[PDB]
Design a protein around this motif. Structure first.
Motif, short mmCIF file in Angstrom:
data_model
loop_
_atom_site.label_atom_id
_atom_site.label_comp_id
_atom_site.label_asym_id
_atom_site.label_seq_id
_atom_site.Cartn_x
_atom_site.Cartn_y
_atom_site.Cartn_z
N UNK A 79 9.86 -1.24 4.06
CA UNK A 79 9.41 0.11 4.42
C UNK A 79 8.57 0.13 5.69
N UNK A 80 8.27 1.32 6.20
CA UNK A 80 7.45 1.47 7.40
C UNK A 80 6.19 2.24 7.02
N UNK A 81 5.12 2.04 7.78
CA UNK A 81 3.97 2.90 7.49
C UNK A 81 3.08 2.23 6.48
N UNK A 82 3.41 2.35 5.20
CA UNK A 82 2.88 1.43 4.20
C UNK A 82 4.02 0.46 3.85
N UNK A 83 3.84 -0.81 4.16
CA UNK A 83 4.86 -1.81 3.91
C UNK A 83 4.47 -2.56 2.64
N UNK A 84 5.45 -2.90 1.81
CA UNK A 84 5.14 -3.31 0.45
C UNK A 84 5.93 -4.53 0.02
N UNK A 85 5.38 -5.21 -0.98
CA UNK A 85 6.09 -6.23 -1.75
C UNK A 85 5.55 -6.20 -3.17
N UNK A 91 -9.19 -8.48 -15.76
CA UNK A 91 -8.33 -7.57 -16.51
C UNK A 91 -6.88 -8.04 -16.43
N UNK A 92 -6.06 -7.42 -17.26
CA UNK A 92 -4.61 -7.62 -17.33
C UNK A 92 -4.04 -6.77 -16.21
N UNK A 93 -3.49 -7.34 -15.13
CA UNK A 93 -2.95 -6.51 -14.04
C UNK A 93 -1.54 -6.00 -14.31
N UNK A 94 -1.26 -4.77 -13.87
CA UNK A 94 0.11 -4.26 -13.89
C UNK A 94 0.51 -3.78 -12.49
N UNK A 95 1.82 -3.88 -12.20
CA UNK A 95 2.43 -3.34 -10.98
C UNK A 95 1.67 -3.72 -9.71
N UNK A 96 1.24 -4.97 -9.64
CA UNK A 96 0.54 -5.45 -8.46
C UNK A 96 1.50 -5.49 -7.27
N UNK A 97 1.01 -5.10 -6.10
CA UNK A 97 1.82 -5.08 -4.89
C UNK A 97 0.99 -5.56 -3.72
N UNK A 98 1.65 -6.19 -2.76
CA UNK A 98 1.06 -6.25 -1.43
C UNK A 98 1.33 -4.91 -0.76
N UNK A 99 0.30 -4.28 -0.21
CA UNK A 99 0.43 -3.00 0.47
C UNK A 99 -0.26 -3.08 1.83
N UNK A 100 0.54 -3.09 2.89
CA UNK A 100 0.07 -3.28 4.27
C UNK A 100 0.14 -1.97 5.04
N UNK A 111 -2.92 7.40 -9.50
CA UNK A 111 -3.47 6.27 -10.23
C UNK A 111 -4.49 5.52 -9.37
N UNK A 112 -5.73 5.33 -9.83
CA UNK A 112 -6.67 4.47 -9.09
C UNK A 112 -6.34 2.99 -9.30
N UNK A 113 -6.67 2.17 -8.30
CA UNK A 113 -6.26 0.77 -8.29
C UNK A 113 -7.35 -0.10 -7.68
N UNK A 114 -7.19 -1.42 -7.83
CA UNK A 114 -8.13 -2.42 -7.33
C UNK A 114 -7.57 -3.08 -6.09
N UNK A 115 -8.36 -3.11 -5.03
CA UNK A 115 -7.92 -3.62 -3.73
C UNK A 115 -8.60 -4.95 -3.45
N UNK A 116 -7.81 -5.92 -3.02
CA UNK A 116 -8.29 -7.19 -2.50
C UNK A 116 -7.78 -7.24 -1.07
N UNK A 154 -3.51 -5.42 2.09
CA UNK A 154 -4.24 -5.48 0.82
C UNK A 154 -3.32 -6.02 -0.27
N UNK A 155 -3.91 -6.65 -1.29
CA UNK A 155 -3.24 -6.81 -2.58
C UNK A 155 -3.81 -5.71 -3.44
N UNK A 156 -2.96 -4.91 -4.08
CA UNK A 156 -3.40 -3.73 -4.82
C UNK A 156 -2.95 -3.92 -6.26
N UNK A 157 -3.92 -4.02 -7.18
CA UNK A 157 -3.66 -4.30 -8.59
C UNK A 157 -3.80 -3.02 -9.42
#
Ligand SMILES: [Fe+3]
Ligand SMILES: [Fe+3]
Lengths: 168, 168
Positions: free
Chosen positions: B30-36, B85-94, B108-113, B161-164
């Motif tokens: 994707x472009x803009x927000x790129x993901x894995x 915590x038990x993470x779900x649907x974790x993504x790299x979000x650039x 949905x609120x999420x945790x950012x690393x 970011x890694x977004x959990x």
């Protein structure tokens, strides 16, 4: 202060139509921040674009004093007539969709008149920790972009401002 | 509140080089927000990208429970092990350089690393009038992106970011 309002009592809708019409004859240049010069140096060969600038090395505003001649019959000319100060290096400054620029300190404050905008276009002052929106209400907003700041446009439409410089 | 920090003591340089090596075997889409996607549904046939689909295709995060097997013997698998915590649907979000997104309320609120970032990458909360920066300091930042917000990256490099997600 960060920002002040000055009523020009301009009609936002006629102002928009006038700007949209002008860009059909004199299109914006660059990308990210698209630009058109509304003031030019006396006797300029390239009056519509010489004042446009975005390279890292900023040059002086003092010579861009002549409101372009074909503006006096347009509503956009009325904006210049109502200014309470003498503007220099006036430009249309349009933020592209989904675009933002670096967090930085500007050289000089400017006055902004928003022509087309949305709730997705904001100024962000980092140390002040304030977020500022400039509405397309026909009034003039002083914005102190010497403060550490960024501006973004998270919308799908260009955010078009007229941006006036001043000496005094 | 908008944010909260839980100490994780991840090493920023090791996380960074872990992410760079993963990405050159599994590129962002994707472009803009790129993901894995780092987590997948059991028996998913497109495990690296199904979790990256847009909201209208995903009922909830809760099915994306499985950390990819090839992560377990890498530094990234260590990160998963240290979460409280038990993470779900974790993504790299650039976030792309000079990019930002609309001012909206996230489902949905999420945790950012933060993996790679700069002073030009911020979250902007419109109603709270607050600006947040998430540093690449190896700690976990909860960000309540349900609040009216945008994010922007005014730098020249991607903000990774890694977004959990979590179910609690
Ligand atoms: Fe007039
Ligand atoms: Fe504030």
């Amino acid at each position: 202060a960060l920002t002040s309002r000055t009523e020009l009592d301009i009609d936002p809708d006629k102002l928009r139509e006038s700007v949209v019409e002008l860009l059909e004859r004199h299109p914006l240049v660059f990308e990210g921040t698209r630009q058109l010069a509304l003031q030019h140096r006396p006797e300029a060969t390239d009056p519509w674009y010489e004042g446009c600038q975005r390279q890292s090395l900023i040059s002086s505003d003092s010579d861009f004093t002549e409101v372009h001649g074909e503006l006096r019959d347009t509503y956009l000319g009325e904006v210049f007539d109502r200014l309470p100060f003498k503007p220099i290096r006036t430009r249309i400054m349009a933020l592209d969709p989904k675009y933002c620029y670096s967090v930085h300190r500007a050289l000089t404050p400017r006055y902004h008149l928003a022509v087309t905008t949305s709730e997705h276009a904001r100024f962000v002052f980092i140390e002040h920790d304030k977020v500022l929106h400039i509405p397309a209400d026909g009034d003039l907003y002083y914005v102190d972009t010497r403060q550490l700041h960024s501006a973004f446009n998270g919308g799908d439409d260009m955010r078009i401002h007229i941006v006036f410089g001043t000496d005094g």
